[PDB]
Amino acid sequence: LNITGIQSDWKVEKIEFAKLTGERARSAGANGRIGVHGKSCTVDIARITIDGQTGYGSSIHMTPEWAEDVIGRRLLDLFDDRGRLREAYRLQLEYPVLDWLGQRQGKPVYDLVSGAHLETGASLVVPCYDTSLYFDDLHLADERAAVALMQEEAMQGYAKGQRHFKIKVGRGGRHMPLWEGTKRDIAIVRGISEVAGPAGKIMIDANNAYNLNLTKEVLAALSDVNLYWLEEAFHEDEALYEDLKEWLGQRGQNVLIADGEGLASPHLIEWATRGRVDVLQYDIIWPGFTHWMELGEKLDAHGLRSAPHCYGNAYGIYASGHLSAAVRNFEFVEYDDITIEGMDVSGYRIENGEIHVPATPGFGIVFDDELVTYLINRSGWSEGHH
Numbered sequence: 447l448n449i450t451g452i453q454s455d456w457k458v459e460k461i462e463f464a465k466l467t468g469e470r471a472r473s474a475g476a477n478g479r480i481g482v483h484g485k486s487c488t489v490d491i492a493r494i495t496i497d498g499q500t501g502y503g504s505s506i507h508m509t510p511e512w513a514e515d516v517i518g519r520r521l522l523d524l525f526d527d528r529g530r531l532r533e534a535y536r537l538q539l540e541y542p543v544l545d546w547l548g549q550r551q552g553k554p555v556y557d558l559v560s561g562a563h564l565e566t567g568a569s570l571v572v573p574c575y576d577t578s579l580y581f582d583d584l585h586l587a588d589e590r591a592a593v594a595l596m597q598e599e600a601m602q603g604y605a606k607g608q609r610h611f612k613i614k615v616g617r618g619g620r621h622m623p624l625w626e627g628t629k630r631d632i633a634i635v636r637g638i639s640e641v642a643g644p645a646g647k648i649m650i651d652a653n654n655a656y657n658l659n660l661t662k663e664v665l666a667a668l669s670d671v672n673l674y675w676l677e678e679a680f681h682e683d684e685a686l687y688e689d690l691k692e693w694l695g696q697r698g699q700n701v702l703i704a705d706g707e708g709l710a711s712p713h714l715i716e717w718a719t720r721g722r723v724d725v726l727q728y729d730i731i732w733p734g735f736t737h738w739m740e741l742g743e744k745l746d747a748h749g750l751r752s753a754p755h756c757y758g759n760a761y762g763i764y765a766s767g768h769l770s771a772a773v774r775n776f777e778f779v780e781y782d783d784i785t786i787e788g789m790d791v792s793g794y795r796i797e798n799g800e801i802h803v804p805a806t807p808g809f810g811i812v813f814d815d816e817l818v819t820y821l822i823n824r825s826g827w828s829e830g831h832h
């Protein structure tokens with residue numbers, strides 16, 4: 447981030463907070479470890495005002511008491527001598543602040559953070575995948591029926607421009623009997639592979655419901671299906687992933703190991719640098735965008751891949767698209783089709799397995815000021831003044 451244009455008199459004038467609500471296009475069922483996710487979605491949003499101009503973005507871990515202590519601070523003082531937002535402000539304010547900087551400079555965040563030296567202008571187009579393939583089949587006793595239902599769901603995404611798909615597996619860990627559930631996982635993946643076709647990338651996500659041998663059984667069953675990655679087969683463990691990697695190598699089966707969401711092992715990155723994990727999946731909100739810019743740099747330096755987790759928060763989708771400009775080995779935007787009341791994302795569009803990020807200021811999302819003001823006053827909160 448270049449902050450040489452930030453004037454020292456620009457101060458945080460107001461911070462306001464509200465929870466926006468919406469719905470995903472199709473209700474999401476269970477996954478390997480927990481129950482139905484549902485259709486309702488929310489996004490916690492803050493609106494910051496600095497030098498008479500507003501910026502909007504995701505905000506977490508912020509209380510009115512915390513914000514009260516930030517009012518009156520100079521924007522410059524929120525940054526490192528290296529142009530990086532200080533740790534203390536990231537979760538609460540990085541998104542509103544980055545949006546703000548984009549509004550004030552009239553640039554999309556991707557241009558602010560890319561560190562690019564070549565002339566800008568080229569449209570930002572980023573691979574994405576459909577993450578919405580949950581255990582939506584559990585009400586069906588028949589395996590073939592289950593496959594057909596999941597194929598239809600994949601087709602729904604395909605019609606909306608999705609070409610790559612992540613399929614939840616691990617049905618036998620908790621929700622179905624172990625052996626039947628595992629057979630069904632395999633059959634569903636095969637079925638979706640037929641939908642996606644030869645250029646469609648297929649990922650599977652067990653949400654830790656497998657163990658090493660169950661994982662080997664599933665992978666062997668799916669030899670003829672080109673799987674792009676295997677995500678959270680079981681809780682990350684250097685010894686188990688070392689084994690799996692060697693096993694995959696012996697079979698010449700090319701499947702990336704992906705991990706890192708939730709409460710990750712504190713040694714996961716170490717394990718990745720030693721070759722046990724290929725794709726890292728820390729969440730786009732926590733630890734966040736600034737963190738990911740630094741992490742992405744380190745991962746790039748080791749030839750490791752970045753695939754920020756995003757689920758449960760629609761805002762993170764658009765953030766992920768912008769982050770891609772700052773990380774060489776950026777894999778995909780994890781996409782969930784969500785409509786949030788008051789959050790106009792129409793500048794973005796999906797086409798042929800890619801999300802086209804608009805070149806408009808900040809994150810290119812236009813919030814409904816009046817609705818947000820209502821929500822702030824009704825249930826949210828406000829600190830500072832105009």
Ligand SMILES: [Mg+2]
Nearest residue numbers: 651677678707
């Ligand atoms: Mg996952």
Ligand SMILES: [Mg+2]
Nearest residue numbers: 678682705706
């Ligand atoms: Mg994990």
